[PDB]
Amino acid sequence: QYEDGKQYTTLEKPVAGAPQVLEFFSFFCPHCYQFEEVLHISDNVKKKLPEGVKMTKYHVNFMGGDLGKDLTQAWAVAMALGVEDKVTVPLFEGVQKTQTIRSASDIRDVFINAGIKGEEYDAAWNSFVVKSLVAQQEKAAADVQLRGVPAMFVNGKYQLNPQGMDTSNMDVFVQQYADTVKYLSEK
C-alpha cells in the first residue's frame, strides 16, 4: 500500500546525520504558501508523529532573486529568536499576497511589526549563530541536491512525492501526506 515511487522516492546516496524530518520551503513558493495557510501540512504531520520526534524546516536561496538570500538569513534569525510562528504568515503574505516585501528593509519591518525589537533583529542578523544557521540550511539543500520546493525528507533517505498522492481533495491529500511521513519515520 506504501510502495516506493508512489508516495515517496528514495535517495541514491543518503545523507548521514540528517534530521529525522526536514522541510524545505521558500516564501516565494506558491505551493509552500498553501502548505502553510490552507493545508497546514507541518502541524498535521507533527500530529501523526511519535511525540518524541523533532521536525526541522529550512528556507532556500534559489527562488526570488537576491531576496531569496535575504529571506534565508531572515529565517535564520527567526529560528535563532524562536519567532517562526510570529513571522511566517506576514512574510508569506508580504511576499506573495501584497508583494510589499521587496528589500531587506521590508523583511525587517515585518519582524518589527511582529514584536521583535529593531536592534535585536539587527544584532541577530549579524550574529555568528545566524551565520552558522545560514550555512546549515545551504548545506542541507546541497546534501540532497535540492532542485525545488516544497520538499520533505525523512532520515535523509526518503523524499515525499505529493504528486503521486491524491490531490483532488485538500483534506484527503493532507491525511495521505501526514500518514506517509509517519510510515517513513517508522522505517
Ligand SMILES: CCN(CCn1cccn1)C(=O)Cc1ccc(Oc2ccc(C#N)c(C)c2)cc1
Ligand atoms: C517540487 C515541485 N513543485 C514546484 C513546481 N510545481 C510543480 C507543480 C506546480 N508547481 C511543487 O509544487 C510540488 C507539488 C506539491 C504539492 C502538490 O499537490 C497539491 C498542492 C496544493 C494543494 C492544495 N490546496 C493540493 C490539494 C495538492 C503538487 C505538486
